[PDB]
Ligand binder design. Structure first.
Ligand code: C6F
Ligand code: CL
Ligand code: CL
Ligand code: CL
Ligand code: CL
Length: 270
């Protein structure tokens, strides 16, 4: 059964490389690049997509990992469309991930662009808190499938045509105190990272803990200091984000609890 489900998921996940046309490069780096593409669909029409380029063992885990994420269906979690693996001239495998195109790019850049004239308009507080709700909803879905994100941050949240946020790509300043110390990581560690992401949103893209350096962070945290309240951040919003950084991770709210707080606060806005 367990196996049977894995076998099916595996069936679905691969896309014939001839259904796919690559385009220009949207952002090149270390692990690799993100490029625009067209995915030929079952109905005969093409779809604009994004295309991410990243041992047979690491190949097979990539494929098994891709199969599980393809099963994820929620509007605040980025849909994996499928995978291609095209071989090089030197012979190393090149594993491509296919994603729906996110017109507005990543949330962190978008927030930064918004403080420029020619960027997106100033983002009203209501919209910012809607971004938080969307992300909490995404992470609730994940925590209910017991899946850990590991790298939640504003730069890994993506903005869709319709300004829905979805979590994606699932960084000392984002890492829970317990995980710095004992390398151990629960959903409550994702909750920590969420709390930081909320702050990145509420500051419109500031790097967490100005004036503190990465190497200083465990002690800074170990002495009870946390991120400060941003100017024009509602106290209730700050309370919600501060609960994410409680020392005991058992004392932190679940995503489901956070989401419910965030939506209530949003509803109470005029
Ligand atoms: C989850 C991985 C990922 N998925 C997607 C996706 N599913 O579609 C994706 N798309 C994407 C779409 C559009 C853009 N644009 C480019 C033009 C720019 N212009 C510049 C010129 N300026 C005058 C006006 C603005 C505005 C942003 C984009 O920028 C990088 C990315 N990116 C992903 N990963 C990135 C990798 C780099 O780090 C951020 C996350
Ligand atoms: Cl091509
Ligand atoms: Cl999506
Ligand atoms: Cl900044
Ligand atoms: Cl701070």
């Amino acid at each position: 059964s367990h196996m049977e489900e894995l076998q099916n998921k595996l069936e679905d996940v691969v896309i014939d490389r001839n259904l796919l046309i690559l385009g220009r490069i949207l952002g090149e780096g270390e692990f690799g690049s993100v490029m625009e593409g067209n995915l030929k669909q079952e109905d005969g029409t093409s779809l604009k997509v994004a295309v991410k380029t990243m041992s047979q063992r690491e190949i097979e885990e990539f494929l098994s990992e891709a199969a599980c994420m393809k099963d994820f269906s929620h509007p605040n979690v980025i849909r994996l469309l499928g995978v291609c693996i095209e071989m090089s001239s030197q012979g190393i495998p090149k594993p491509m991930v296919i994603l729906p195109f996110m017109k507005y790019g990543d949330l962190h850049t978008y927030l930064l662009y918004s403080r420029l004239e020619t960027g997106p308009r100033h983002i009203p507080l209501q919209t910012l808190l809607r971004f938080m709700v969307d992300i909490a909803l995404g992470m609730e879905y994940l925590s209910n499938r017991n899946f850990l994100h590991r790298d939640l941050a504003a730069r890994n949240c993506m903005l869709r045509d319709d300004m829905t946020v979805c979590v994606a790509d699932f960084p000392v300043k984002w890492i829970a105190i317990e995980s710095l110390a004992d390398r151990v990581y629960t959903s409550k560690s994702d909750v920590w990272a969420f709390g930081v992401t909320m702050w990145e949103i509420a500051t419109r893209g500031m790097t967490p803990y100005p004036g503190v350096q990465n190497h200083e962070m465990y002690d800074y945290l170990l002495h009870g200091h946390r991120l400060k309240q941003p100017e024009d951040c509602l106290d209730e919003l700050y309370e919600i984000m501060y609960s994410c950084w409680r020392t005991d991770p058992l004392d932190r709210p679940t995503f489901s609890v956070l989401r419910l707080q965030l939506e209530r606060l949003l509803e109470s806005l005029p």
